[PDB]
Amino acid sequence: VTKFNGLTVLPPLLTDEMIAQY
Amino acid sequence: SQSIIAYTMSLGAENSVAYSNNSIAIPTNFTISVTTEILP
């Protein structure tokens, strides 16, 4: 596969472990 | 007693399917379920 000046990058609810469990 | 707790979420109940080359599951009772769907 292929910032801190007020741009809040939030992680999603389902991470890579929860997609792999699905 | 009751308070907001933090825990790892569960994606469903664990149910291991017992695979077998000489066993099959056939339903004997049916339930007519009515579900709704709302779309704009």
Helix (H/G/I), strand (E/B), else coil: A5: coil
> Per residue, what are the HEC states of B1-40?
CCCCCCCCCCCCCCCCCCCCCCCCCCCCCCCCCCCCCCCC
Phi and psi at residue B38, in whole multiples of 5°? -120, 120
Q: Which residues of A touch B9 (CB under 8 A)?
A: 18
Which residues in chain B (3-32) have CB-CB distances under 8 A to chain A? 9, 11
The helix, strand and coil proportions of chain A, stated in percent and rounded to the nearest 5, come to 25, 0, 75
Give the Å distances, CA to CA, from B37 to A7, B10, B32, B34.
37, 25, 16, 10
**Both tokens assigned to B21:** 């080359």
Q: Which of A9, A22, A10, A17 is nearest to B8 (CA)?
A: A17
Dist CA B11 CA B6 (whole Å): 16
Instruction: Give ∠ CA B37-B39-B40 in degrees, rounded to 5.
Output: 155
Please report residues of B whose CB lies closer than 8 A to that of A18: 9, 11
Is the separation of the CB atoms in B11 and A22 below 8 Å? Answer: yes
Asked how this structure was determined, the answer is cryo-EM
